[PDB]
Design a protein around this motif. Structure first.
Motif, PDB file in Angstrom:
ATOM      1  N   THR A 120     -46.381 -35.306 -63.131  1.00 39.56           N
ATOM      2  CA  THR A 120     -45.822 -34.397 -62.141  1.00 39.56           C
ATOM      3  C   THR A 120     -44.303 -34.467 -62.268  1.00 39.56           C
ATOM      4  OG1 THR A 120     -47.708 -34.851 -60.693  1.00 39.56           O
ATOM      5  CG2 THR A 120     -45.806 -33.747 -59.711  1.00 39.56           C
ATOM      6  N   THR A 121     -43.672 -33.333 -62.571  1.00 36.48           N
ATOM      7  CA  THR A 121     -42.247 -33.321 -62.864  1.00 36.48           C
ATOM      8  C   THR A 121     -41.537 -32.264 -62.029  1.00 36.48           C
ATOM      9  OG1 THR A 121     -42.485 -31.786 -64.742  1.00 36.48           O
ATOM     10  CG2 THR A 121     -42.614 -34.143 -65.227  1.00 36.48           C
ATOM     11  N   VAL A 122     -40.302 -32.575 -61.654  1.00 35.92           N
ATOM     12  CA  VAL A 122     -39.398 -31.629 -61.016  1.00 35.92           C
ATOM     13  C   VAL A 122     -38.105 -31.604 -61.814  1.00 35.92           C
ATOM     14  CG1 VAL A 122     -37.931 -31.182 -59.027  1.00 35.92           C
ATOM     15  CG2 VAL A 122     -40.334 -31.765 -58.686  1.00 35.92           C
ATOM     16  N   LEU A 123     -37.660 -30.411 -62.184  1.00 38.36           N
ATOM     17  CA  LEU A 123     -36.331 -30.206 -62.746  1.00 38.36           C
ATOM     18  C   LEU A 123     -35.502 -29.547 -61.654  1.00 38.36           C
ATOM     19  CD1 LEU A 123     -34.341 -30.260 -65.168  1.00 38.36           C
ATOM     20  CD2 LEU A 123     -35.192 -27.978 -65.715  1.00 38.36           C
ATOM     21  N   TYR A 124     -34.571 -30.298 -61.073  1.00 38.84           N
ATOM     22  CA  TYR A 124     -33.766 -29.778 -59.977  1.00 38.84           C
ATOM     23  C   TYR A 124     -32.478 -29.183 -60.523  1.00 38.84           C
ATOM     24  CZ  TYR A 124     -30.746 -29.325 -55.957  1.00 38.84           C
ATOM     25  OH  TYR A 124     -29.877 -28.830 -55.007  1.00 38.84           O
ATOM     26  N   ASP A 125     -32.210 -27.938 -60.133  1.00 39.58           N
ATOM     27  CA  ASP A 125     -31.094 -27.152 -60.662  1.00 39.58           C
ATOM     28  C   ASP A 125     -29.852 -27.391 -59.804  1.00 39.58           C
ATOM     29  OD1 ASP A 125     -29.414 -25.335 -61.856  1.00 39.58           O
ATOM     30  OD2 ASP A 125     -30.633 -23.575 -61.397  1.00 39.58           O
ATOM     31  N   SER A 126     -29.271 -28.585 -59.975  1.00 42.09           N
ATOM     32  CA  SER A 126     -28.047 -28.919 -59.252  1.00 42.09           C
ATOM     33  C   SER A 126     -26.894 -28.008 -59.652  1.00 42.09           C
ATOM     34  CB  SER A 126     -27.675 -30.384 -59.491  1.00 42.09           C
ATOM     35  OG  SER A 126     -26.937 -30.547 -60.695  1.00 42.09           O
ATOM     36  N   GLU A 140     -30.637 -32.080 -48.829  1.00 45.93           N
ATOM     37  CA  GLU A 140     -31.402 -31.154 -48.005  1.00 45.93           C
ATOM     38  C   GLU A 140     -31.974 -30.027 -48.851  1.00 45.93           C
ATOM     39  OE1 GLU A 140     -28.442 -30.211 -45.112  1.00 45.93           O
ATOM     40  OE2 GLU A 140     -29.030 -31.836 -43.757  1.00 45.93           O
ATOM     41  N   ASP A 141     -31.180 -29.509 -49.795  1.00 48.53           N
ATOM     42  CA  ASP A 141     -31.685 -28.492 -50.712  1.00 48.53           C
ATOM     43  C   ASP A 141     -32.814 -29.030 -51.587  1.00 48.53           C
ATOM     44  OD1 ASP A 141     -31.232 -25.697 -51.818  1.00 48.53           O
ATOM     45  OD2 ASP A 141     -31.038 -26.874 -53.649  1.00 48.53           O
ATOM     46  N   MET A 142     -32.776 -30.321 -51.924  1.00 46.96           N
ATOM     47  CA  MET A 142     -33.786 -30.891 -52.808  1.00 46.96           C
ATOM     48  C   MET A 142     -35.101 -31.140 -52.084  1.00 46.96           C
ATOM     49  SD  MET A 142     -31.544 -33.686 -54.879  1.00 46.96           S
ATOM     50  CE  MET A 142     -32.673 -34.317 -56.122  1.00 46.96           C
ATOM     51  N   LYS A 143     -35.035 -31.561 -50.812  1.00 44.55           N
ATOM     52  CA  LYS A 143     -36.215 -32.013 -50.071  1.00 44.55           C
ATOM     53  C   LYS A 143     -37.460 -31.152 -50.315  1.00 44.55           C
ATOM     54  CE  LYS A 143     -37.952 -32.766 -45.369  1.00 44.55           C
ATOM     55  NZ  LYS A 143     -38.629 -34.055 -45.678  1.00 44.55           N
ATOM     56  N   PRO A 144     -37.436 -29.833 -50.063  1.00 39.93           N
ATOM     57  CA  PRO A 144     -38.670 -29.050 -50.269  1.00 39.93           C
ATOM     58  C   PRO A 144     -39.149 -29.053 -51.707  1.00 39.93           C
ATOM     59  CG  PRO A 144     -36.805 -27.591 -49.926  1.00 39.93           C
ATOM     60  CD  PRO A 144     -36.320 -28.972 -49.625  1.00 39.93           C
ATOM     61  N   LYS A 145     -38.234 -29.113 -52.672  1.00 42.45           N
ATOM     62  CA  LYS A 145     -38.630 -29.156 -54.072  1.00 42.45           C
ATOM     63  C   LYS A 145     -39.241 -30.493 -54.474  1.00 42.45           C
ATOM     64  CE  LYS A 145     -34.751 -26.095 -54.483  1.00 42.45           C
ATOM     65  NZ  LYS A 145     -35.701 -24.955 -54.621  1.00 42.45           N
ATOM     66  N   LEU A 146     -39.099 -31.534 -53.655  1.00 43.03           N
ATOM     67  CA  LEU A 146     -39.617 -32.854 -53.985  1.00 43.03           C
ATOM     68  C   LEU A 146     -40.938 -33.178 -53.298  1.00 43.03           C
ATOM     69  CD1 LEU A 146     -36.392 -35.084 -53.938  1.00 43.03           C
ATOM     70  CD2 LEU A 146     -37.183 -33.466 -55.674  1.00 43.03           C
ATOM     71  N   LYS A 156     -43.938 -32.336 -53.929  1.00 42.64           N
ATOM     72  CA  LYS A 156     -44.999 -32.680 -54.868  1.00 42.64           C
ATOM     73  C   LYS A 156     -44.850 -34.087 -55.438  1.00 42.64           C
ATOM     74  CE  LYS A 156     -44.146 -30.595 -59.064  1.00 42.64           C
ATOM     75  NZ  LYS A 156     -43.865 -29.476 -60.008  1.00 42.64           N
ATOM     76  N   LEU A 157     -43.695 -34.733 -55.260  1.00 43.27           N
ATOM     77  CA  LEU A 157     -43.486 -36.070 -55.803  1.00 43.27           C
ATOM     78  C   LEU A 157     -43.935 -37.185 -54.860  1.00 43.27           C
ATOM     79  CD1 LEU A 157     -40.034 -35.510 -57.574  1.00 43.27           C
ATOM     80  CD2 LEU A 157     -42.301 -35.716 -58.628  1.00 43.27           C
ATOM     81  N   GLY A 158     -44.219 -36.883 -53.593  1.00 39.85           N
ATOM     82  CA  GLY A 158     -44.939 -37.791 -52.714  1.00 39.85           C
ATOM     83  C   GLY A 158     -44.165 -38.309 -51.516  1.00 39.85           C
ATOM     84  N   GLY A 159     -42.833 -38.326 -51.555  1.00 39.72           N
ATOM     85  CA  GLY A 159     -42.060 -38.941 -50.491  1.00 39.72           C
ATOM     86  C   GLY A 159     -41.309 -38.012 -49.563  1.00 39.72           C
ATOM     87  N   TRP A 160     -41.499 -36.701 -49.670  1.00 33.91           N
ATOM     88  CA  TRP A 160     -40.594 -35.758 -49.028  1.00 33.91           C
ATOM     89  C   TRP A 160     -41.326 -34.567 -48.428  1.00 33.91           C
ATOM     90  CZ3 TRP A 160     -39.742 -38.213 -53.691  1.00 33.91           C
ATOM     91  CH2 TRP A 160     -38.713 -39.162 -53.680  1.00 33.91           C
TER      92      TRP A 160
END
Length: 270
Positions: A205-211, A258-264, A266-270
């Motif tokens: 399970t991967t997230v690429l966050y577009d900072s 805060e911008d990252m929270k919804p995108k995370l 699927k990773l389990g902690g957010w």
């Protein structure tokens, strides 16, 4: 049911965590140092916020990021604590799942934010199209080490627009442009590698966050986020985007978390 959050990177992620300092626990999720110490922001950074402010459940932060870090000193060298050395610290201390961090594939998240220094040091001396694949391949091999340990959940942050930090703005618009074009090639190859890894492994399970896009949105419209402009510096970490001429302050880091929270989620902690 805690989430073990192992992070790797440079000064945009450093907190000064020591593998011999106080270790993370439910009452002390960062372990060491105190939340808000050791960063380049005058307060918490994005990891501290993700761990203690944006968390949906218990997150334990083992933050191995070090300032001055490149991916591997055999490629673009900088300081001794490169990403490779961080992965080696992880292999030395936590990879075998000790009682201090008895993680599993289901509860461990591995976050990597690297590339600021590699690009910052090699954007004028190397050919982006042929050189950035070498950096990205070395990053993938490091990731493969954790995969072999049993890690299955990964978060990658692409490189933010450090081209528009005061440090690079001072060097002239054509330098800003050369740096930014090299950076964009790097971020494209990072996205390609994350996609290929995810597809080839099949069980990650991967997230690429577009900072890059998020920070760019702020830099293009700073007053919409309560900043007076996109160039001022203030070490209080909140009055300006920039804490010094090369690092954003705690307020930017909180906005990013805060911008990252919804995108995370699927990773389990957010």
């Amino acid at each position: 049911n805690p989430t073990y959050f192992f992070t790797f990177g440079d000064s945009y992620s450093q907190t000064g965590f020591s593998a011999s300092g106080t270790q993370p626990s439910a009452s002390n999720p960062m372990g060491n140092p105190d939340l808000g110490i050791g960063t380049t922001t005058n307060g918490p950074n994005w990891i501290g916020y993700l761990t203690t402010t944006e968390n949906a459940s218990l997150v334990l932060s083992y933050n191995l990021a070090a300032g001055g870090a490149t991916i591997d000193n055999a490629l673009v060298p900088a300081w001794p604590g490169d990403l490779a050395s961080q992965f080696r610290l992880f292999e030395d201390v936590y990879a075998d799942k000790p009682a201090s961090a008895p993680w599993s594939a289901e509860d461990a998240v591995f976050g990597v934010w690297i590339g600021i220094n590699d690009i910052g040091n090699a954007y004028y001396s190397t050919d982006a199209e042929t050189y950035t694949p070498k950096l990205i391949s070395r990053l993938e091999s490091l990731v493969e080490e954790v995969y072999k340990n049993g890690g299955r959940k990964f978060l990658f942050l692409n490189v933010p627009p450090t081209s528009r930090s005061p440090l690079f703005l001072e060097q002239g618009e054509e330098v800003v442009k050369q740096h930014a074009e090299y950076l964009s090639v790097y971020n494209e190859n990072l996205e390609g590698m994350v996609d290929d890894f995810t597809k080839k492994k099949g069980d990650v399970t991967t997230v690429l966050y577009d900072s890059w896009s998020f920070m760019t949105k702020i830099l293009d419209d700073p007053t919409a986020y309560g900043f007076p402009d996109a160039t001022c510096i203030n070490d209080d970490g909140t009055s300006c985007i920039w804490w010094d001429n090369y690092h954003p302050g705690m307020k930017y880091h909180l906005l990013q978390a805060e911008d990252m929270k919804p995108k995370l989620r699927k990773l389990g902690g957010w």
